């Protein structure tokens, strides 16, 4: 897996082929975050092979559809349980993020894990993501935004667009 761009949430359902042993096997659904449906189905086969005794050839995908978020205009706290392979051993981890969409939270988690542990999307194995009430959050970096009268200025505004007037005669101002 390569965490290309913003990820998406996919509901993927699948089952074993009908065998003479059992007329119909149970259906299995799964939440998968992936750039598109091809890699979504690939990851579904990976995970279901890991858990059950299933394979791409002996099973079939039944429904692979994107899942939209039910509130894309209210900010939410997301709690993420995951599992990754470091240079020496693998670890379980719980993390907190804060944004609009579940897919956005998951891709933010991927970027964060890459930045902080040098882990990579193939080593990272997401297992659980739940929207957490504001009073159950545990990390200070997200709890300190739980203030109704939040207030902060923008202290040091670094100049951008510094090549349009490449040779100017004014020293730029940084206070606004």
């Amino acid at each position: 897996m390569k965490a290309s761009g913003t990820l998406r949430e996919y509901k993927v359902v699948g089952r074993c082929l009908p065998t003479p042993k059992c007329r119909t096997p149970p259906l299995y659904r799964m939440r998968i975050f992936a750039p598109n449906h091809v890699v979504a189905k690939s990851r579904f086969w990976y995970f279901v092979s890991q858990l059950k005794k299933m394979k791409k050839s002996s099973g079939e995908i039944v429904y692979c559809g994107q899942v939209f978020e039910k509130s894309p205009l209210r900010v939410k706290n997301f709690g993420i349980w995951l599992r990754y392979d470091s240079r020496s051993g693998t670890h379980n981890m719980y993390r907190e993020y804060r944004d609009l969409t579940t897919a956005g939270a998951v891709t933010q988690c991927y970027r964060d894990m890459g930045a902080r542990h040098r882990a990579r999307a193939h080593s990272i194995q997401i297992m659980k993501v739940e929207e957490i009430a504001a009073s159950k959050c545990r990390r200070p970096a997200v709890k300190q935004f739980h203030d109704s009268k939040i207030k902060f200025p923008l202290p040091h505004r670094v100049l951008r667009r510094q090549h349009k007037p490449r040779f100017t005669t004014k020293r730029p101002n940084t206070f606004f």
Partner: protein, 168 residues
């Protein structure tokens, strides 16, 4: 749930070059008539052809083409193997003189056979000279890796249509 019938026609493109190729891979590419880089051909899907594509997975990009993709390929870059020559399909008599025995007469029912494979798909496809495609405008993503890992080799399901649009 309604599981649609899995596709029976595939479009295959050679992604990698000539230098340093295993004998089995080279043989299967010759059997698929992809001898040069960026040749394209239609393959009808069954167990044997799927296993051959699996064998030559690192060297090809393939998928399920649209009806629009079939039209664009056949009209823009449609050449016929007449007297084992490469003759441009500029009218209908060239198709009729070589395929009329299969009651496929015109460009439209050539396209119909290829899309809905029908009976004489083998003969129609063998009549079609392998398509010579330009370089992919805008650029590939990564030639040497599978499409699932963010590369270009392997089995795009239906993104092959975007690839065909961008490569014509």
């Amino acid at each position: 749930f309604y599981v649609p019938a899995e596709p029976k026609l595939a479009f295959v493109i050679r992604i990698r070059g000539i230098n340093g190729v295993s004998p089995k891979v080279r043989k299967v590419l010759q059997l698929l008539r992809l001898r040069q880089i960026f040749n394209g051909t239609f393959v009808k899907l069954n167990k044997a052809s799927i296993n051959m594509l699996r064998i030559v997975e690192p060297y090809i990009a393939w998928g399920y083409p649209n009806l629009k993709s079939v039209n664009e390929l056949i009209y823009k870059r449609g050449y016929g193997k007449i007297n084992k020559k490469r003759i441009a399909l500029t009218d209908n008599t060239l198709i009729a003189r070589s395929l009329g025995k299969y009651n496929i007469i015109c460009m439209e029912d050539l396209i119909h056979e290829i899309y809905t494979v029908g009976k004489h798909f083998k003969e129609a496809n063998n009549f079609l000279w392998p398509f010579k495609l330009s370089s992919p405008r805008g650029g590939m993503k990564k030639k040497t890796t599978h499409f699932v890992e963010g590369g270009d080799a392997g089995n795009r399901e239906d993104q092959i249509n975007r690839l065909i649009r961008r490569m014509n």
